């Protein structure tokens, strides 16, 4: 079934995503060294360009 479109495509969009999900969802942590590597992360994704979108960078 996979072969045929069945609009998957449709169902599963790149804009789409279960990331945010997953940072609804809390877990306790016995460190909060992952969260520091997350929040450097989103500091460079505020720095960009910005230009149309970004789509081309």
Do not use: F, P
Request: proline share 0%; glycine share 4%.
């Amino acid at each position: 079934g996979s072969k045929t479109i069945q609009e998957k495509e449709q169902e599963l969009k790149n804009l789409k995503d279960n990331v945010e999900l997953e940072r609804l969802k809390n877990e306790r942590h016995d460190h909060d060294e992952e969260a520091e590597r997350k929040a450097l992360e989103d500091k460079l994704a505020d720095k960009q360009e910005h230009l149309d979108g970004a789509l081309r960078y």
